[PDB]
Symmetry: D5
Subunit: 167 residues, 10 copies
């Protein structure tokens, strides 16, 4: 694992799905803004994707504080694309406004210390990266428990407040 608090967050690049198209995406495309970078275990499971949907539905609240949100699994960009194109009712994701980055090679998961070598995918990991590319926060959940948009917004707001005013 290369992810260390107060150090540049580890570099990543891959293929994401953004508004239904394949795009090359780099961690460093987000310099100048806070980034919530998070991992989820797999597309197309039998468990509703409440957390991705929750982050998707609430994106303008991140955007109004100069923050982007990128989600990532070990799935191919082709799987992400199909998942998005499957309607929510059939067990799919549906349209989403959050980029789904593919970590097909697993390099990215390993660098972020979230990769489950016995399973082949990640745990639930979330990372808050500031506008200088510095890693400010790490949250790792065992699989059965998701993340909260509200907790994430508090953390982002607090790191931004302390960046300007100290303490």
């Amino acid at each position: 694992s290369k992810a260390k608090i107060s150090k540049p967050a580890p570099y990543w690049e891959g293929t994401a799905v953004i508004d239904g198209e394949f795009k090359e995406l780099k961690l460093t495309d987000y310099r100048g803004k806070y980034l919530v970078f998070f991992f989820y275990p797999l597309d197309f499971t039998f468990v509703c994707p409440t957390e991705i949907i929750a982050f998707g539905d609430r994106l303008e609240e991140f955007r109004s504080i100069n923050t982007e949100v990128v989600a990532c699994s070990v799935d191919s960009q082709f799987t992400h694309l199909a998942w998005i194109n499957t309607p929510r009712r059939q067990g799919g994701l549906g349209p989403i406004r959050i980029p789904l980055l593919s970590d097909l090679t697993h390099q990215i998961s390993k660098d972020y210390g979230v990769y489950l070598e016995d399973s082949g995918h990640t745990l639930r990991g979330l990372f808050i990266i500031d506008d200088k590319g510095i890693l400010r926060q790490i949250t790792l959940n065992d699989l059965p428990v998701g993340r909260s948009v509200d907790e994430t917004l508090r953390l982002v707001q607090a790191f931004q407040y302390t960046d300007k005013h100290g303490e």
Copy 2:
């Protein structure tokens, strides 16, 4: 790579989709029969899956010579399941009678020497394993070119003929 001609084919186990259900599958479940074990690059691409369909449609010809056929990619069993449940017309696989083994951890691809470390999936690799678990044939194609059911049947028939009659 651990795959060597005339040596036991390397052991594998994982989750497969077989008739639309998840099943634990082991290379060694096929002892007593010839096995055509093959890898393909990914589910849900924009390229028709002619080869998987071809092998699927022609399965009884393998079965009448005591031969099973298993296909494998680095995709999750959940992705395989969704791919099978997407109709052929929408860019899916449709029903298939061939197990789709998941190599989510990539261990299996690495052992078979078919894993593309820069890409995160396999090339087009096919392996003929006899009823004693011994590896008899290796075919590796660069991605753009598929396999032939007829060539595969010739090879299986020939190895079976030579097992009994020599030469």
Copy 3:
């Protein structure tokens, strides 16, 4: 770091201040209960200890869901006790309901991966350990931003709910 989600949380033992007394405290003392185990950077700073006080003031919310809280810094047990004996209105901690564990040697901070080699103290690390001694959650924050009791309770509840009932929803 020896701290791995899904594995036995790394063993620790040390001197804690518990109700104004020095007691030997061990991780296995918490077997049979959930444990919120968190690190904080230093006693006696000029910045209000709002986040440690919050946990102690709200401790019954943990205890009513069979969960204990232990706080830890690299400070000695003597510094802990002096901090506790300083009134909040003077910037002290005041009397507190949760053990303050001393990690003077730095071993526990290092095993938890929260030690800052260049500063000599830890960042803000929090760890949720189930009643079987298994690590379930790791929250690590840069120095300037504290933890939430509400978030921590949501996490503990969620882990106990899924411990008993499993999958979240259809």
Copy 4:
């Protein structure tokens, strides 16, 4: 093995019998053409050389798609020439149209990953190399089962088709 799909096929050079003469033959001599490069186990066995003869007898099918064929075993160039000079009706090879490369030192077999350390000869390995010297295909068979000219032509055609036009179908 140095043989990797998508990488420059491993360089080789040696003495080949070409139209009953010894010539120095190199892999780069084939630049600008596809090359089917295959190994076979041994000259002068009691088993009909049906598979080597097939390739030579059908060579114009390769040449009309800008492809050359070179066969190779661990035998010396002298053994190759003697095999060629033995009539098919005596079990010899007879005159043949494709070079027979000698890999007497075993280096080329080893670079191709087809050498059998315990036997001192190769298995049945075949390699399709594009006109840029890149390896596109590896076919390795156990000893008792030969290669197909038809399969090999299908593969070469498919690689040239996708070299120019790309993806197979919608």
Copy 5:
């Protein structure tokens, strides 16, 4: 330990409390003066701080012989400041004229060979460093026993004397 008699005292730097405020302090800030540099185990313990106070009250005796005194423990500078701000009556140090240097990382203590790996703090170690930065004397005491200001003054005057005049006694 890096501390060797007749070699430059091991470099150190850190945050010290000097007249009730945080200051960066370096060993090299003392070039041109003798330095009494001593370690004590911990702030805020139940044992009376006799030895630091004795050095403090008697500081002028060192200053009149061009000598500074600096004390050090593994406590943070914030704990050092709180201890100074605690009246001697409740267990504090009270106002003090000597800097309290913080060795929070434990590096300075390790470099001086005074750190106790099993307890997380130092034993009672004292060092006489001359005006040229050279280490002249090492005193190491097990925990229970303090240092004497008079003995320290005798060693300092002895070194200054032999610096200037070489000779002891015919």
Copy 6:
């Protein structure tokens, strides 16, 4: 090389052609007899095979002094059989009384220090091995020059003589 004068000749085994058929042959099959074991570079070359034929025709001279002869090259046993089956007139060996051992893996040749890494075959090497498996004599010739049956007979009789009677001449 593992071949050392006065030590057991390096063990070997392989397939030999003996009276026109394949036989497994082992160095230890010769215990109780002297063995002339010699290597020649290749079957089927343009240079006349004078030396093998000379050993062949004169075999009875070795047999009458309890000595066997075995020849070896890196060719396969199939090439050895074809060479024997080729009339001397067209470039063959013709019928032959000495076994042709195959060293296809190159192991036996390496063990005897006769292998040429850059050519893939042996130089002209000959070894006299006594009835107790001990190596008594090594002759190594660059390629162009053959061995003499008379010289080989002189060495064999000399060793048998000194075996029995020790002495050379007063």
Copy 7:
């Protein structure tokens, strides 16, 4: 160095001059008593050995508190004896009540961390070892500056006091 505070003091053994006689001496011979174990650089030098003399002359202040003193240098036992048999007024040490241990091989000096590799003798090192053989105090001085008997006594008394009562205040 093998000398570590709170750990058994490094074992030593060798020939000492005791009472103008050569005797084999061991650290373990001192179990049951406190030991002031001190190294001095060389016999027969041009500077008054008032520091070894001072310990010998005030020896009873150690013994009345169950403490022995042993002095040690890299000189041979023969040289120690010659030094003793040479009168104070003449460069000698004269008769002395404390054992002089020879560290001729330098093993003991190296074990105590007091050996100077470039000069071939020790600095001025003093070690306080309790009745259980545990090292309690280390005093190391650069060559020009001697030890004080009063400070050594203060230290021994303080260790013995805290051994029994544990608690300054």
Copy 8:
């Protein structure tokens, strides 16, 4: 061993007895000529040295084909000279036309692979070296069995023949 067929023969140099005089001799002194370079075990033994004698007595058969012979043992040049100055009829070698090279340090024997570590002398090793300094032939015999001048001649003639014409038939 450094002696490898087809490679330059390992360089050697040392003192030889040539013509009853000590001379410095080198492998390179032989460039332009074929060299029979042969090792024999020891001077002064109880068995007829008929094998060195045989080479000396038939030396002209070598020289008429541009070939020199040099014999070598681990004995010193002084011993070689004593052996030469001792008459055949008395255990000696007598006068001899071939240089006797001393390998007293054993370096030359070890470089040629002929040294027996347990006995301290060589086996019966012979080396044929061409006019370009390339090693062409190695003959190694167990101690009891000598070399033949006729076979050596046959070998030299054959190398020279094939050097020029290349092709038996």
Copy 9:
């Protein structure tokens, strides 16, 4: 390990010696241009008469008339050498002496000449003949109980000087 090799430069040494009752820095190379007899003796002030040193002392003009110096060495300090010299013979001392007593306090010189006994802390009886070019010509090592002869040493020096000139 020993650095003293016959026919090689004698190992370099430097230290304090007592010369005519005074301390002087002395080094091996001070002797270049002259032959040097350099010998070790085990210790000052033992109960065994210092016969051999006295013997070399008394016969020093025999060495000097053949351009040869003599230097004695033990591991004792230069302060002990001075006391031993300043102690009358009848009291067990050396008495006045006209050869330098070199101190090998650090023991490095003894170790370099291969005469140090690591279990005792002093040297055995070792003697070295070094020629005017600094070359070691002779090594004599005696177990403790047996001393060196001045006559033998003289014979050896004159023999080396003779063959230096005439072979």
Copy 10:
């Protein structure tokens, strides 16, 4: 490297010696129970008179009356030693001799006694006094041009036997 250490067992040696004109296997331990003077000389048959060996030969009864044997050694073979003995002195030989000449043909004995000159292939002039318990008591190493004295050797042996008994 040398194994010869004063006060330790002399290094073991075995070889062929010429004794009274015959070959005999000889080993160091044949001398246990007696003192042994064991010395090396560089070579047989040189142009330099063999004075020292003859000297030890001629004076052998002086050694034997003090329970002491003498054995001479060079790197020459036992065959050369025999020829040298069987060559009359006036012809440059040794002539009849009553000390064993040991052959160190392999050079191991010379190396173990630290007397072998690796650039020349023979030994320097080395002499060893070994007591009746096999203990090395004295080492004398002389550069080539200078020989050993029988009188010194006698003095050294009698001195060791004297202090063995009386200190």
